[PDB]
Design a binder for this molecule. Structure first.
Ligand SMILES: Nc1nc2c(ncn2[C@@H]2O[C@H](COP(=O)(O)OP(=O)(O)NP(=O)(O)O)[C@@H](O)[C@H]2O)c(=O)[nH]1
Lengths: 35, 814
């Protein structure tokens, strides 16, 4: 969507599973919100 | 990248807004799919950061596409709010809150694993919020690369996954919404690989082959899914999988959609350099520049992105099928609103009226980097919220009549919640998601903001949702206690499913939904919330000290002076009476006369004994009593206070191992005092009374609702576990699931939640509340009996001598 709208911040995979636990287990643990 | 003005303009056309989230079992690819959406359509503004809670997407559809949208549309631009949802799926209320602010959901299902319990759990909760679902069967690449699966097998797998999903939907979806099931032919199911960037809908292929087969796409998309066959020999479309001769016909879906894809994979991955250019040319795919040199997966990834861009498939289902707030609030209004269905605020919700009084629901408080400040996250259902607006904050217990939970305060700032960032805005009308700053202190978790004095307050899914796992928490360094007490508050506010309270034994208790949940909580508490070394340990179980029969003989004890003596006997108080005292029928401050009539006429007591109760204990109101049965003691009235005080002391600290007494009755048979008050003083009689009580006690043969929901076939595991833990079934009721009620000793409940899922295949869900006290028949003074082991462990733990002093130790022979 950010290709169509400059007003969308892109979030990459590692920006979403960013927690130290998530990295340690290699899964999502926390809900993440993106726009 | 848009400007605040562009965003605000986009937010005016709520007909072209989509509030939704992604539902997925761990590892099914929820993250990589959203990264795909964000990279393709993410929106960004043209030093305060927050935890990413929601992301904005932007999408434009073609004029023809927009005509297909079966709902009010204004133009070809769409604003999509991808709302973050927690990862704990125990039917928690944190999840329900997040879903509550959405109207549609993108459900991710794995090609191989299919629909798993976690998936069913969030979907079920979603359906309970009248959310419309759309599916994406993800990880398709695994079936082609790893498993080498065949087309018909892949098809069948897809069809079974779609069926599993529509079983959950048909079961929990409100009949008033109509058919909310999902159908590949109608474009509500996508297939693809979030890791690799390609996906499609039957619709896109119908568009592609319609103007080629000389047929309108409405006809084409019905033919591109299910039992539609095109016999190349007859050049006709039929619904029979065989021809006249009975030979096998390949399904249209396999022949026109899968085959081209299969051929691309096979040709590119096998380096058939003379077959690839033709295939690409036929599909009208163009490699430019350095791409012409790629081979293998690299070429494949690049070719599939051009052939069928992923985000495109997902955005198509979101825009064309997920509902916009105007449509939804019309049939969601009544549930969402506790007040009158005919009420002015309820109507404003049904109409998503921005000019009405405010009806803003606070979904949760979100952590910010603004030094300990939490911003309120929510949705404007009615009216419009403005910066610096005077509003009425109503907590979970507010009622239009009382001033409970009410908090009038101005809203400091209205901010757009865009991922980890915020963007101050002046106002926000009904139908939109938004964040409020300055509400921290007045609201923790859910709430309801209104601008109407009449306004009533706003309302929650098949994971554990009860704090059944608990431990005692304490600082390793005494001086840190303040930070711990503060950390718990911070922890409680940030987690709806977390519980903390002080135990009867003076320990801070932290309880979590499951062992894993509790672990995250303790880690976060120790590292962040409190940020101090914590010590974790079991919760200590509290016991009661009672007597099973009357004292085998009169208890006799003298005072330090050796001049005063008390003669008494102890006997059991009936459970019904103890209960009556504990629950308010028999009270310490009631008029002794009327109370005695009740105890005598209704509980079998002798009315004189009752009229003569001297006190209750411990704390002056406990379920233990001292009754005066003396006849001619001269200075009785003068020692009463000392006797009462000694009882409060004796019943507070039993002689078995220091636990409180319960159901203990003490009868004072006789008292011999010294003539002179000097030396009859409390310092003499208080010890005497306590010593005598302990003796009468020891001479009286001393002794010291788990609701489970689950499927029938699983119930057997429940009985299996209970029997292994001195449990006892109480009731088995019920066309939902079953609910088994049973008594479970507290000292047999550590790890219970684990052994239960293990014995029911993770299908049983426990709930536990303290119910009653139960008398262990074994000898508390025998270090090897059940009761005795418990007594020996507590004594060692407290540094007392192991042997329990016997009655002779408090008896003073004449
Ligand atoms: N082959 C292939 N792999 C993919 C695709 N989409 C995601 N993956 C891979 O599958 C793995 C899991 O993706 P991920 O997005 O983290 O899964 P999840 O569903 O978010 N995780 P969890 O359930 O723990 O949240 C990753 O290694 C990712 O590269 C795809 O389209 N094709």
């Amino acid at each position: 969507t950010a290709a169509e709208n400059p007003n969308v911040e892109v979030k990459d995979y590692g920006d979403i599973d960013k927690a130290p636990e998530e990295r340690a287990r290699g899964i999502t643990i926390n809900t993440a919100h993106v726009e | 990248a848009f400007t605040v003005d562009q965003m605000r303009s986009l937010m005016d056309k709520v007909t072209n807004v989509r509030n939704m989230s992604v539902i997925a079992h761990v590892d099914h690819g929820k993250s990589t799919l959203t990264d795909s959406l964000v990279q393709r359509a993410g929106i960004i503004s043209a030093g305060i950061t927050i935890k990413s809670t929601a992301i904005s997407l932007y999408s434009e559809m073609s004029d023809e596409d927009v005509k297909e949208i079966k709902q009010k549309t204004d133009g070809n631009s769409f604003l999509i709010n991808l709302i973050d949802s927690p990862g704990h799926v125990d039917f928690s209320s944190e999840v329900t809150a997040a879903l509550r602010v959405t109207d549609g959901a993108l459900v991710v299902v794995d090609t191989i694993e299919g629909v798993c319990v976690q998936t069913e759990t969030v979907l079920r909760q979603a359906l309970g919020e009248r959310i419309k679902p759309v599916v994406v069967i993800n990880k398709v690449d695994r079936a082609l690369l790893e498993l080498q699966v065949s087309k018909e097998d892949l098809y069948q797998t897809f069809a079974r996954t779609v069926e599993s999903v529509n079983v959950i939907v048909s079961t929990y979806a409100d009949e008033v919404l109509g058919d909310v099931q999902v159908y590949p032919a109608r474009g509500t199911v996508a297939f693809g690989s979030g890791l690799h960037g390609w996906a499609f809908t039957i619709r896109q292929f119908a568009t592609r082959y319609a103007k080629k087969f000389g047929v309108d796409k409405a006809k084409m998309m019905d033919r591109l899914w299910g039992d539609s066959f095109f016999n190349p020999k007859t050049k006709k479309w039929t619904n029979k999988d065989t021809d006249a001769e009975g030979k096998p016909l390949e399904r249209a879906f396999n022949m026109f959609i899968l085959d081209p894809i299969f051929r691309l994979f096979t040709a590119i991955m096998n380096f058939k350099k003379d077959e690839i250019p033709v295939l690409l040319e036929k599909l009208e795919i163009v490699l430019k520049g350095d791409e012409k040199d790629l081979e293998g997966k690299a070429l494949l990834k690049v070719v599939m992105r051009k052939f069928l861009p992923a985000a495109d498939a997902l955005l198509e289902m979101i825009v064309l099928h997920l509902p916009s707030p105007v449509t939804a609030q019309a049939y969601r209004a009544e549930q969402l609103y506790e007040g009158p269905a005919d009420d002015a605020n309820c109507i404003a919700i049904k109409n998503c009226d921005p000019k009405a009084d405010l009806m803003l629901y606070v979904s949760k408080m979100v952590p910010t980097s603004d030094k300990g400040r939490f911003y309120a996250f929510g949705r404007v259902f009615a009216g419009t919220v403005k910066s610096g607006q005077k509003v009425r904050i109503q907590g979970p217990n507010y009622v239009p009549g009382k001033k409970d939970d009410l908090f009038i305060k101005a809203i400091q700032r209205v901010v757009l919640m865009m991922g980890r960032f915020v963007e101050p805005i002046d106002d926000c009308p009904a139908g939109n998601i938004i964040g409020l700053v300055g509400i921290d202190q007045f609201l923790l978790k859910t709430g309801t903001l209104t601008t109407s004095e009449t306004a009533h307050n706003m309302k929650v899914m098949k994971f554990s949702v009860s704090p059944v796992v608990q431990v005692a928490v304490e600082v390793k360094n005494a001086n840190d206690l303040p930070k711990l007490v503060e950390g718990l508050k911070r922890l409680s506010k940030s987690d709806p499913c977390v519980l903390t309270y002080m135990s009867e034994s003076g320990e801070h208790i932290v309880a979590g939904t499951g062992e894993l949940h509790l672990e995250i909580c303790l880690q976060d508490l120790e590292h962040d919330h409190a940020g101090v070394p914590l010590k974790i340990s079991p919760p200590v179980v509290a016991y009661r000290e009672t007597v099973e029969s009357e004292s085998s003989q009169t208890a006799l004890s003298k005072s330090p002076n050796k001049h005063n003596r008390i003669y008494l006997k102890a006997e059991p108080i009936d459970e019904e009476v103890s209960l009556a005292i504990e629950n308010g029928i028999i009270n310490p401050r009631d008029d002794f006369k009327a109370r005695a009539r009740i105890m005598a006429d209704d509980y079998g007591w002798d009315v004189t004994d009752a009229r003569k109760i001297w006190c209750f204990g411990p704390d002056g109101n406990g379920p233990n009593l001292v009754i005066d049965q003396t006849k001619a003691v001269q200075y009785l009235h003068e020692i009463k206070d000392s006797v009462v005080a000694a009882f409060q002391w004796a019943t507070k600290e039993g002689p078995i191992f220091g636990e409180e007494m319960r159901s203990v009755r003490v009868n004072i048979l006789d008292v011999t005092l010294h003539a002179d008050a000097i030396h009859r003083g409390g310092g003499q009689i208080i010890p005497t009374m306590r010593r005598a009580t302990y003796a009468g006690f020891l001479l009286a043969d001393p002794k010291i609702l788990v609701e489970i929901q689950c499927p029938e076939q699983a119930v057997g595991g429940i009985y299996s576990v209970l029997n292994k833990k001195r449990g006892q079934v109480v009731s088995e009721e019920q066309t939902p699931l079953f609910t088994v009620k049973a008594y479970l000793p507290v000292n047999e409940s550590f790890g219970f939640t684990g052994e239960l899922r293990q014995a029911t295949g993770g299908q049983a869900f426990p709930q536990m509340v303290f119910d009653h006290w139960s008398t262990l028949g074994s000898d508390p003074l025998d270090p090897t009996s059940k009761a005795g082991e418990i007594v020996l462990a507590a004594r060692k733990r407290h540094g007392m001598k192991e042997e329990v002093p016997g009655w002779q130790e408090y008896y003073d022979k004449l």
